[PDB]
Amino acid sequence: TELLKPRTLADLIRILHELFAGDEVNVEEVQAVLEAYESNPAEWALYAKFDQYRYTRNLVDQGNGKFNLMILCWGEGHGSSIHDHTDSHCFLKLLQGNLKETLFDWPDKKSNEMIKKSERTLRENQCAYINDSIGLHRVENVSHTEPAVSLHLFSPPFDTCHAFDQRTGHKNKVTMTFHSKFGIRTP
Ligand SMILES: [Cl-]
Ligand SMILES: [Fe+2]
Ligand code: NA
Ligand code: NA
Ligand code: NA
Ligand code: NA
Ligand code: NA
Ligand code: NA
Ligand code: NA
Ligand code: NA
Ligand code: NA
Ligand code: NA
């Protein structure tokens, strides 16, 4: 329960394996530790694999079954769907650039446009947190000039979630695909 500042990405990962050694999750502590790591591009260049047309998901660590740690790479103008997180914890730390996070409420059964609840700009080294009881969100690199890179921790791991149609609130199931694993391209 003694949180030290992660010196490196590797150190961070080791501290995370400690924090998730058990069955439950201290959210505020995981968030603090993630925010405390100072992004060092050299340490994660291996995982920062971009695609021209959409954002990529790059597996960094499998957290001995308790979590998935991954790096997402967002080209200029790349963004996600409005999505949930499959009853898991979601931590999002910026390693490079900025991302816009837009919050949505869970839709009612009636077909209505999903109106934004709020939005915020996540900046380098900032760490955000979301879960399904908080709501839904969309994440976007709105920059025309700067690629964005983020570090995501999901616990428990999941490889499916829902995307929501902003016009209706209708949801469809989506399967998450890894662009790379441990620095190896996995087409
Ligand atoms: Cl996310
Ligand atoms: Fe998300
Ligand atoms: Na490292
Ligand atoms: Na650091
Ligand atoms: Na995209
Ligand atoms: Na990309
Ligand atoms: Na991907
Ligand atoms: Na950016
Ligand atoms: Na957004
Ligand atoms: Na959610
Ligand atoms: Na479903
Ligand atoms: Na990878």
From Swiss-Prot:
Lineage summary: Eukaryota, Metazoa, Chordata, Craniata, Vertebrata
GO CC field: cytosol
Residues noted as binding Fe cation in the record, renumbered to the chain: H83, H85, H137
Protein's UniProt keywords contain Metal-binding: yes
Protein name: Cysteine dioxygenase type 1
Taxonomic source organism: Rattus norvegicus (Rat)
Signal peptide feature range: none
Assembly information from the UniProt record: Monomer.
GO BP term, pick one: response to cAMP
Enzyme class: oxidoreductase
Disulfide bond positions: none
Catalytic activity: L-cysteine + O2 = 3-sulfino-L-alanine + H(+)
Expression sites (tissue/organ): Highest levels in liver. Significant expression also in kidney, lung and brain.
Single annotated GO MF: ferrous iron binding
Family: Belongs to the cysteine dioxygenase family.
Covalent cross-link 3'-(S-cysteinyl)-tyrosine (Cys-Tyr), where: C90-F154
Cofactor(s) recorded in Swiss-Prot or TrEMBL: Fe cation; Ni(2+); Zn(2+)
Role, per record: Catalyzes the oxidation of cysteine to cysteine sulfinic acid with addition of molecular dioxygen.
Superkingdom, taxonomy of origin: Eukaryota
Assigned keywords, A-Z: Dioxygenase, Iron, Metal-binding, Oxidoreductase, Thioether bond
Biological or metabolic pathway of the protein: Organosulfur biosynthesis; taurine biosynthesis; hypotaurine from L-cysteine: step 1/2
Cofactor descriptive note: Binds 1 Fe cation per subunit. Ni(2+) and Zn(2+) can be used to a lesser extent.
EC numbers, comma separated: 1.13.11.20
Factors inducing expression: By increase of sulfur amino acid intake.
